[PDB]
From a paper:
Here, we report a structure of VMAT2 bound to TBZ at 3.1 Å resolution in an occluded conformation using single-particle cryo-electron microscopy (cryo-EM), describing the architecture of VMAT2, identifying the high-affinity TBZ binding site, and revealing the mechanisms of drug and neurotransmitter binding, inhibition, and transport. To overcome this, we incorporated mVenus and the anti-GFP nanobody into the N- and C-terminus respectively of human VMAT2 to provide mass and molecular features to facilitate the cryo-EM reconstruction, this created a hook-like fiducial feature by reconstituting the interaction of these proteins on the cytosolic side of VMAT2. After successive optimizations, our final construct contained mVenus fused to the N-termini at position 17, and the anti-GFP nanobody at position 482 which we denote the VMAT2 chimera. The structure of the VMAT2-TBZ complex reveals that both the cytosolic and lumenal gates are closed, which precludes solvent and ligand access from either the cytosolic or lumenal compartments. We find R217 and Y418 form the outer cytosolic gate with the guanidino group of R217 involved in a cation-π interaction with the aromatic benzyl group of Y418 which seals off cytosolic access to the binding site. A striking feature of LL4 is the location of W318 which positions its indole side chain directly into a lumenal cavity near the TBZ site, acting as a plug to completely occlude the lumenal side of the transporter. TBZ adopts a pose which is predominantly perpendicular to the direction of the TM helices in the lumenal half of VMAT2 near the location of the lumenal gating residues. The TBZ binding site exhibits an amphipathic environment, comprised of both polar and non-polar residues where the tertiary amine of TBZ orients itself toward the negatively charged surface of the binding site near TM7 and -11, and toward E312.
Author numbering: 17 to 47, 119 to 476
């Protein structure tokens, strides 16, 4: 039982965090051109930036400690610091709550995302199994961002009060209970002692090319989402029906990307899904400067969400293959590098990177984050055969 059931646990533990981070979307409206939103965004920019820096600064401290504690207690902090955040939103009268309420969730996201991916890395040892399995587990992000806003928005308008958080606190304790049974995560058990120290993974070039590819893929969508024309007009008229829908294309395309390139990327060679993984991000972003209508953003969202899925699902199992080929196999830490790289685009990119566009115009910030991705694609020639220890 245990091998296969931990995929269902880590899928659900990624789904609920990725649904919870996204159900705040139709709530945000309570607080001349499609990219001028860079200037209106700054309040919303801080809601994307806060979760991702508090999650990012935590990744070394969860990833390192996972080796000392054992995996199960970090996954339980992943359920729990995210659950107490779910309950916190249920009486958020002001932005303050939202901002801090997010901060607690960031820690839960780390606790869940690093230790859960390390649990799949530890448990699924063969590359074909680990590719199919991590592609399906990363399908938790892709299903969470899709499922969450349509459900959250319909409850927020039709049922009212703060209902979309109480019904999610119902589903989060169901996952927490299923962890208490399936993992038996109430015991103190350490991992193989004094394994690879993170500075030595960070000084090996071959892990950086994979982590960098996971980061630079996310950076293209991280500048885009905070500054969509989705926040101001929606209060006034029946166009509010678009408030939850705008992520649906990027989050169907991620699902098919992480699900298909969970199986196919192993077979063709995963390096070609960083090369054709960031060529597609870059060219999909490069259609944004020719949009002048929100419908014109549906096409570039779909190729970004697909290509994010093709990179993540191909490069997350490369983290495991590299510690299995150049280092010592304790995955408490390498997934700390992979997850800060995933996360950092949302931490840094919206606000610190948003300062680029205001002096220049925003179609230049989008076109350049596009080229930085087509230029990264040939750098993965180092991942054809990482030379053995
Ligand atoms: C309201 O806040 C947030 C909203 C959203 C995200 C993150 C947020 O906060 C940090 C995720 C993060 C991801 O994983 C990407 C999934 C895509 C490729 C389908 C992009 N966006 C989708 C919406």
């Amino acid at each position: 039982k245990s091998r296969k059931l931990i995929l269902f646990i880590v899928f659900l533990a990624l789904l609920l965090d990725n649904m919870l981070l996204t159900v705040v979307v139709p709530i945000i409206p309570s607080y001349s051109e499609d990219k001028d939103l860079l200037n209106e965004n700054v309040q919303v920019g801080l809601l994307f930036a806060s979760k991702a820096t508090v999650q990012l600064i935590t990744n070394p401290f969860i990833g390192l400690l996972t080796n000392r504690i054992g995996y199960p207690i970090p996954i339980f902090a992943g359920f729990c610091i995210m659950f107490v955040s779910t309950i916190m939103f249920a009486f958020s009268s002001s932005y303050a709550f939202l901002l801090i309420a997010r901060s607690l969730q960031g820690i839960g996201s780390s606790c869940s995302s690093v230790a859960g991916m390390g649990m799949l890395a530890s448990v699924y040892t063969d590359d074909e199994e680990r590719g199919n399995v991590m592609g399906i587990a990363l399908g938790g992000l892709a299903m969470g961002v899709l499922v969450g806003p349509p459900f959250g928005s319909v409850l927020y308008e039709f049922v009212g009060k703060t209902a979309p958080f109480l019904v999610l606190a119902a589903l989060v304790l169901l996952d927490g209970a299923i962890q208490l049974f399936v993992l038996q995560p109430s015991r103190v058990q350490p991992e193989s002692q004094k394994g690879t120290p993170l500075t030595t993974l960070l000084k090996d070039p071959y892990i950086l090319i994979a982590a960098g590819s996971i980061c630079f893929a996310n950076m293209g969508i991280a500048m885009l989402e905070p500054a969509l024309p989705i926040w101001m007009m929606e209060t006034m008229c029946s166009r509010k029906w678009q408030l939850g829908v705008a992520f649906l294309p990027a989050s169907i395309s991620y699902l098919i990307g992480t699900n298909i390139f969970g199986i196919l990327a192993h077979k063709m060679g995963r390096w070609l899904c960083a090369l054709l993984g960031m060529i597609i991000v870059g060219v999909s972003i490069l259609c944004i400067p020719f949009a002048k209508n929100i419908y014109g953003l549906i096409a570039p969202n779909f190729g970004v969400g697909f290509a994010i899925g093709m990179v993540d699902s191909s490069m997350m199992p490369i983290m495991g293959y590299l510690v299995d080929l150049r280092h010592v196999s304790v995955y408490g830490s390498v997934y700390a590098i992979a997850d800060v790289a995933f996360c950092m685009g949302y931490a840094i990119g919206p606000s610190a990177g948003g300062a680029i566009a205001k002096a220049i115009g925003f179609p230049w910030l989008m076109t350049i984050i596009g080229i930085i991705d087509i230029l990264f694609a040939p750098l993965c020639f180092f991942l054809r055969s990482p030379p053995a220890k």
